[PDB]
Amino acid sequence: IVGGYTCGANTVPYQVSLNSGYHFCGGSLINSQWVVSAAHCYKSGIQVRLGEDNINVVEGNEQFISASKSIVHPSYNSNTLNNDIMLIKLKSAASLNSRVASISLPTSCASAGTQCLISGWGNTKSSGTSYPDVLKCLKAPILSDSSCKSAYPGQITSNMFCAGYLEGGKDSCQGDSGGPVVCSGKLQGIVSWGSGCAQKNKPGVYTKVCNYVSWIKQTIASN
Ligand SMILES: NCc1csc(-c2cccs2)n1
Ligand SMILES: [Ca+2]
């Protein structure tokens, strides 16, 4: 997250870190057994780390649970990033509590102008590189479809929205991918892509979660 703020330990209780020897992506806990992330974060050998604040120090609220199964969306295209969503099932159920909690799925799509919270352990610089230990947060609005398309001609599908600041300075970045965009207590986005971070006229692009609720529910119901 570039241009954000320190969230505070365990104030984003649905935020998980995906670890394969090291943090590599975010995700969002949606029930005691299942995490939402980005399909471009797929790999084998994932350990899900819940209850994290400083991802390099054991602080006492973590739960580490290995994935039993990953399911990439049926229509994911890794060239266009269309349908950039996957589900990850945990080998055992997380203990839910005030610091490890699931986030509700949307019941309708959010509109441009809605305020949201984006969070993650990604890079905090727009030139160069610095990775934080503790979780970073950014409040950002959803941008209109039309400004998102004009920002990225030929690349925004109906399964994507933009959020952030056309002026630049405040955005998600590398290592945030797969993490949450939560608006009014609902998971409306997943950190997906952009062109650099925090550049003028290049806001972040996010997977539009409301399009996937019936796939998420039916997948959980049978897996
Ligand atoms: N600035 C939005 C965004 C989200 S993930 C991402 C990057 C991935 C790799 C380099 S940068 N950028
Ligand atoms: Ca920790």
Walkthrough of the structure:
The chain is mainly beta and 223 residues long. It folds into two domains: 1-12 and 103-210, Thrombin, subunit H (Beta Barrel), CATH 2.40.10; 13-102 and 211-222, Beta Barrel (Thrombin, subunit H), CATH 2.40.10. Helices cover 7% and strands 32% of the residues. It is built from two helices and 13 strands. The protein has helices spanning 145-151, 213-221, and strands at residues 5-6, 15-19, 23-31, 34-37, 47-50, 63-72, 86-90, 115-120, 136-141, 160-163, 180-183, 186-193, 204-208. The strands form two sheets. A seven-stranded antiparallel sheet has the order 1-9-8-11-12-13-10. Strand 2 (15-19) and strand 3 (23-31) form a beta hairpin. The longest helix has 9 residues, at 213-221. The N and C termini lie far apart (33 Å). Calcium ion is lined by residues 52, 54-55, 57-59, 62.
